[PDB]
Scaffold this active site. Structure first.
Site, PDB file in Angstrom:
ATOM      1  N   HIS A 173       1.726   9.242   1.491  1.00 35.59           N
ATOM      2  CA  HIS A 173       1.204   8.171   2.333  1.00 35.59           C
ATOM      3  C   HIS A 173       2.229   7.114   2.704  1.00 35.59           C
ATOM      4  CE1 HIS A 173       0.143   5.987  -1.489  1.00 35.59           C
ATOM      5  NE2 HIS A 173      -0.251   7.186  -1.881  1.00 35.59           N
ATOM      6  N   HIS A 196       6.969  -0.695  -0.849  1.00 34.81           N
ATOM      7  CA  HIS A 196       6.829   0.341   0.161  1.00 34.81           C
ATOM      8  C   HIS A 196       6.570  -0.347   1.486  1.00 34.81           C
ATOM      9  CE1 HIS A 196       2.783  -0.680  -1.199  1.00 34.81           C
ATOM     10  NE2 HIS A 196       2.454  -0.514   0.071  1.00 34.81           N
ATOM     11  N   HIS A 238       4.469   0.043   5.504  1.00 35.30           N
ATOM     12  CA  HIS A 238       3.548   0.668   6.446  1.00 35.30           C
ATOM     13  C   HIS A 238       4.156   0.483   7.826  1.00 35.30           C
ATOM     14  CE1 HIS A 238       0.351   0.656   3.349  1.00 35.30           C
ATOM     15  NE2 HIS A 238       1.021  -0.406   2.932  1.00 35.30           N
ATOM     16  N   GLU A 274      -0.108  -4.039   8.764  1.00 33.10           N
ATOM     17  CA  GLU A 274      -1.491  -4.038   8.303  1.00 33.10           C
ATOM     18  C   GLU A 274      -2.133  -5.394   8.553  1.00 33.10           C
ATOM     19  OE1 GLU A 274      -1.354  -2.156   4.268  1.00 33.10           O
ATOM     20  OE2 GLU A 274      -2.072  -0.482   5.448  1.00 33.10           O
ATOM     21  N   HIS A 318       5.554  -4.269   1.542  1.00 27.42           N
ATOM     22  CA  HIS A 318       4.711  -4.732   0.441  1.00 27.42           C
ATOM     23  C   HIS A 318       5.501  -4.623  -0.846  1.00 27.42           C
ATOM     24  CE1 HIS A 318       0.842  -3.763   2.862  1.00 27.42           C
ATOM     25  NE2 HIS A 318       1.386  -4.933   3.168  1.00 27.42           N
ATOM     26  N   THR A 333      -4.606  -1.857   0.072  1.00 21.25           N
ATOM     27  CA  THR A 333      -4.907  -1.401   1.426  1.00 21.25           C
ATOM     28  C   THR A 333      -4.958   0.113   1.529  1.00 21.25           C
ATOM     29  OG1 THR A 333      -2.614  -1.305   2.184  1.00 21.25           O
ATOM     30  CG2 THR A 333      -3.722  -3.443   2.358  1.00 21.25           C
TER      31      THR A 333
HETATM   32  N1  LIG Z   1      -0.603  -1.170   0.217  1.00 21.33           N
HETATM   33  S1  LIG Z   1      -0.854  -2.196  -1.085  1.00 21.33           S
HETATM   34  O1  LIG Z   1      -2.201  -3.049  -0.962  1.00 21.33           O
HETATM   35  O2  LIG Z   1       0.452  -3.118  -1.244  1.00 21.33           O
HETATM   36  C1  LIG Z   1      -0.954  -1.220  -2.582  1.00 21.33           C
HETATM   37  C2  LIG Z   1      -0.281  -1.670  -3.700  1.00 21.33           C
HETATM   38  C3  LIG Z   1      -0.324  -0.936  -4.858  1.00 21.33           C
HETATM   39  C4  LIG Z   1      -1.086   0.213  -4.885  1.00 21.33           C
HETATM   40  O3  LIG Z   1      -1.152   0.919  -6.087  1.00 21.33           O
HETATM   41  C5  LIG Z   1      -1.757   0.646  -3.750  1.00 21.33           C
HETATM   42  N2  LIG Z   1      -2.558   1.846  -3.776  1.00 21.33           N
HETATM   43  C6  LIG Z   1      -1.925   3.069  -4.169  1.00 21.33           C
HETATM   44  O4  LIG Z   1      -0.772   3.114  -4.455  1.00 21.33           O
HETATM   45  N3  LIG Z   1      -2.761   4.236  -4.207  1.00 21.33           N
HETATM   46  C7  LIG Z   1      -2.204   5.486  -4.667  1.00 21.33           C
HETATM   47  C8  LIG Z   1      -1.934   5.322  -6.190  1.00 21.33           C
HETATM   48  C9  LIG Z   1      -2.888   4.431  -7.034  1.00 21.33           C
HETATM   49  C10 LIG Z   1      -2.751   3.044  -7.058  1.00 21.33           C
HETATM   50  C11 LIG Z   1      -3.595   2.232  -7.802  1.00 21.33           C
HETATM   51  C12 LIG Z   1      -4.573   2.859  -8.557  1.00 21.33           C
HETATM   52  C13 LIG Z   1      -4.655   4.248  -8.510  1.00 21.33           C
HETATM   53  N4  LIG Z   1      -3.833   4.989  -7.774  1.00 21.33           N
HETATM   54  C14 LIG Z   1      -1.704  -0.085  -2.603  1.00 21.33           C
HETATM   55 ZN   LIG Z   2       0.996  -1.404   1.163  1.00 16.02          ZN
END
Ligand SMILES: NS(=O)(=O)c1ccc(O)c(NC(=O)NCCc2ccccn2)c1
Ligand SMILES: [Zn+2]
Length: 257
Positions: free
Chosen positions: A61, A91, A93, A103, A116, A195
């Site tokens: 992603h 990371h 977007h 975003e 982010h 997000t």
């Molecule tokens: N895009 S964001 O709001 O900065 C963000 C920050 C940290 C994150 O872990 C995520 N979400 C994410 O990484 N999802 C895939 C891995 C995950 C993250 C959190 C809990 C379970 N699995 C989004």
């Molecule tokens: Zn993010």
């Protein structure tokens, strides 16, 4: 599995993650006129001098630059935050076109990308525990516009060929995230969520007013990454952004007038 395509994109996420329709979802449009200046907001404290980047990973992603978060090496404090938050990863977007990709939006304006920097509250001991808490994370969001190159981003851009497809990781040591920060640390802040799934409502968002500029060549290299794994049909990793969500009962505060 969730994604950003036609049949699994953001408008579908609520089926697997019902919190997608929650009360504090991110991102949001930042209406700069409606944001209230708060004089009790402290300046942000970014202490990145001792940061230890370890590797870079295509997770299907985005790509994450990961840090050693087993000690207070790269921490965020101050601002709206109580206590110390440790940097775990950053990371981005981004869009398929320079006119979209961020975003958060600012008075409905979309930037080409958004960085982010993800931090977790040390009182919870680790990231997995922090995400279960309403004050578990602090994400520092920084907009990217296309213009002059950002020299501090080039080492990220140059390693992306080694992590083109989902699941690939690369050693990525000695990367200094201070090279990604704009001059000013003026910010907006509001309570929100991750997000991407699981969309947990655990984030104090801190979004910097000043974007950084990156070159067209730099953002073009982001767009060469793939959502798919190696040996699967190629789908370019572009438009991996969630659109703005309802602000509901929230107020965005500004650290500046
Ligand atoms: N895009 S964001 O709001 O900065 C963000 C920050 C940290 C994150 O872990 C995520 N979400 C994410 O990484 N999802 C895939 C891995 C995950 C993250 C959190 C809990 C379970 N699995 C989004
Ligand atoms: Zn993010």
């Amino acid at each position: 599995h969730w994604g950003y395509g036609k049949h699994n994109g953001p408008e579908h996420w609520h089926k697997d993650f019902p919190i997608a329709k929650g009360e504090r979802q991110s991102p949001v449009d930042i209406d700069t006129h409606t944001a209230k200046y708060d004089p009790s907001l402290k300046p942000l404290s970014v202490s990145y001098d001792q940061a230890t980047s370890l590797r870079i990973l295509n997770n299907g992603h985005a790509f994450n630059v990961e840090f050693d978060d087993s000690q207070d090496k790269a921490v965020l404090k101050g601002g709206p935050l109580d206590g110390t938050y440790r940097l775990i990863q950053f990371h981005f977007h981004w869009g398929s076109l320079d006119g979209q990709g961020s975003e958060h939006t600012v008075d409905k304006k979309k930037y080409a990308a958004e960085l982010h920097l993800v931090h977790w509250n040390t009182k919870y001991g680790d990231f997995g525990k922090a995400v279960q808490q309403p004050d578990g994370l602090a994400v520092l969001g920084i907009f990217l516009k296309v213009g002059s190159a950002k020299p501090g981003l080039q080492k990220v851009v140059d390693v992306l060929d080694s992590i083109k497809t989902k699941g690939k990781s690369a050693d990525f040591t000695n990367f200094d995230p201070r090279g990604l920060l704009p001059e000013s640390l003026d910010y907006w802040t509001y309570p929100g969520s991750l997000t991407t799934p699981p969309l947990l409502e655990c984030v104090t968002w801190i979004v910097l007013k000043e974007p950084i500029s990156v070159s067209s060549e730099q953002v073009l290299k982001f767009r060469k990454l793939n959502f798919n794994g190696e040996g699967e049909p190629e789908e370019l990793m572009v438009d991996n952004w969630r659109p703005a969500q309802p602000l509901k009962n929230r107020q965005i505060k500004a650290s500046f007038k």
